[PDB]
Amino acid sequence: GDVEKGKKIFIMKCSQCHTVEKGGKHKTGPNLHGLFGRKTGQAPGYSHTAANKNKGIIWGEDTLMEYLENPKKYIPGTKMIFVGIKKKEERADLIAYLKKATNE
């Protein structure tokens, strides 16, 4: 994926509720630093729903591709109220950005 395009998608669609940088603030949603390789619902210092804590999957490209297409379908009971990103290429670009931004 294209990280430059992914950053723009993040700003447009996600930044209302999330930060990505190390030590970045929790907003409506959790700060996402450290996301990849982590079990669902373990953002440090954030109060997740039981649903997000109990999904049990490991965040990576494939599980994010599915979640971000339709969050409530993947995690019924989530408090993330976001319709999803329909286009596969857009999710791929977004996820490439997240992979970079949440690990630097």
**Residues in touch with its own copies (CB under 8 A):** 16-17, 28-29, 50-51, 54-57, 72-77, 79-83
Number of H-type helices and E-type strands within the chain: 5, 0
Q: Which residues bind ligand HEC (CB under 6 A)?
A: 13-14, 16-18, 28-30, 35, 40-43, 48-49, 51-52, 55-57, 68, 78-82, 85
Is 17 known as a binding-site position? yes
**Which C-beta is closer to its own copies: that of 37 or that of 104?**
37
**Which C-beta is closer to ligand HEC: that of 1 or that of 30?**
30
d(CA 92, CA 81): 21
**Which C-beta is closer to its own copies: that of 36 or that of 82?**
82
Contacts of 38 (CB under 8 A, 6+ apart): 58, 59
Q: Is the distance from CB of 18 to CB of 97 less than 8 angstroms?
A: no
| Known binding-site residue numbers for heme c | 14, 17-18, 80
